[PDB]
Amino acid sequence: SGWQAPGPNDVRAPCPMLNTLANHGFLPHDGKGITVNKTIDALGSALNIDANLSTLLFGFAATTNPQPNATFFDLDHLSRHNILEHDASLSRQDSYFGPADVFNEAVFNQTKSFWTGDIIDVQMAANARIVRLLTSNLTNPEYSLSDLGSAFSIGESAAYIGILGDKKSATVPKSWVEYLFENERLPYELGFKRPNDPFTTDDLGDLSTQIINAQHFPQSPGKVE
Numbered sequence: 001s002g003w004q005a006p007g008p009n010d011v012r013a014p015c016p017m018l019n020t021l022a023n024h025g026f027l028p029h030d031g032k033g034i035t036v037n038k039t040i041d042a043l044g045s046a047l048n049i050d051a052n053l054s055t056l057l058f059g060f061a062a063t064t065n066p067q068p069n070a071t072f073f074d075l076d077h078l079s080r081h082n083i084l085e086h087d088a089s090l091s092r093q094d095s096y097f098g099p100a101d102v103f104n105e106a107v108f109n110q111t112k113s114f115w116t117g118d119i120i121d122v123q124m125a126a127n128a129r130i131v132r133l134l135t136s137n138l139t140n141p142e143y144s145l146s147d148l149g150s151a152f153s154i155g156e157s158a159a160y161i162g163i164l165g166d167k168k169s170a171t172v173p174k175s176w177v178e179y180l181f182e183n184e185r186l187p188y189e190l191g192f193k194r195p196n197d198p199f200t201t202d203d204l205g206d207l208s209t210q211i212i213n214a215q216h217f218p219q220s221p222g223k224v225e
């Protein structure tokens with residue numbers, strides 16, 4: 001009850017969380033025809049994300065619809081390389097190697113190795129993201145990261161801490177994050193509960209700044225902020 005894997009005509013994204021919300025039915029289970037109202041309602045219902053942040057994210061999502069000026073998106077639209085989808089994902093391979101939409105065990109094994117305790121803090125999240133950037137740059141001859149892709153990468157690490165975890169301590173249990181990625185199901189059984197405080201654009205901004213502040217390069221190699 002409450003969760004179903006995708007079937008052959010369902011579409012999924014490179015986003016572990018939208019995929020999770022489609023699997024649960026917060027978003028349409030076939031991943032299609034997502035409007036601004038469905039986004040607001042789904043992200044508010046499942047996660048207590050506020051309307052303004054839901055609206056901002058929807059605005060970006062709509063840009064990936066191949067129809068111009070679209071009022072909806074489908075989850076597979078989000079997989080279009082170098083619009084929102086970017087290299088040096090935590091759990092997906094770069095498009096250069098293979099499809100950048102589905103979970104990739106090799107890549108996620110790398111990310112997990114930088115999550116060094118049972119509680120993920122801002123330092124571990126920043127560290128895991130950095131090694132993905134450097135690893136893609138040195139292994140992918142087509143490696144790219146746009147100013148928008150960089151902002152998204154930083155915000156994705158901020159998101160799993162603040163939306164799945166405790167945005168005030170800026171910590172999240174590692175098992176919860178691993179479960180979300182590996183199952184695209186919410187880790188309710190491991191203790192996750194929908195937060196009572198809405199998650200805002202300013203919350204995401206605050207955690208994003210913390211991520212950048214936890215980066216200690218002697219000299220930044222390329223697009224790291």
Ligand code: HEM
Pocket residue numbers: 014015016017018039043047049054057058060061078079084085086087088089090091092152156157159160163164
């Ligand atoms: C309408 C809302 C959203 C849209 C349009 C969106 C879109 C995306 C896209 C396009 C990616 C792929 C970027 C890449 O190449 O890694 C992504 C990744 C991600 N998203 Fe979402 N997302 C949304 C909401 C959420 C929420 C609510 C969370 C909460 C935890 C979330 C967490 C993440 C994480 C952690 C990743 C990184 C995956 C990885 O690096 O393997 N997203 N999202």
Ligand SMILES: *[C@@H]1O[C@H](CO)[C@@H](O)[C@H](O)[C@H]1NC(C)=O
Pocket residue numbers: 105106109
């Ligand atoms: C990922 O790590 C697991 C856990 O040790 C291992 O069994 C698996 O083969 C690894 N996968 C890759 C592709 O490295």
Ligand SMILES: *[C@@H]1O[C@H](CO)[C@@H](O)[C@H](O)[C@H]1NC(C)=O
Pocket residue numbers: 137143144145221222223224
């Ligand atoms: C990849 O690394 C080089 C440093 O060799 C840097 O000039 C380049 O900006 C990096 N690319 C990205 C997209 O960060």
Ligand SMILES: [Mg+2]
Pocket residue numbers: 014085086087088089092093094100
């Ligand atoms: Mg990617």
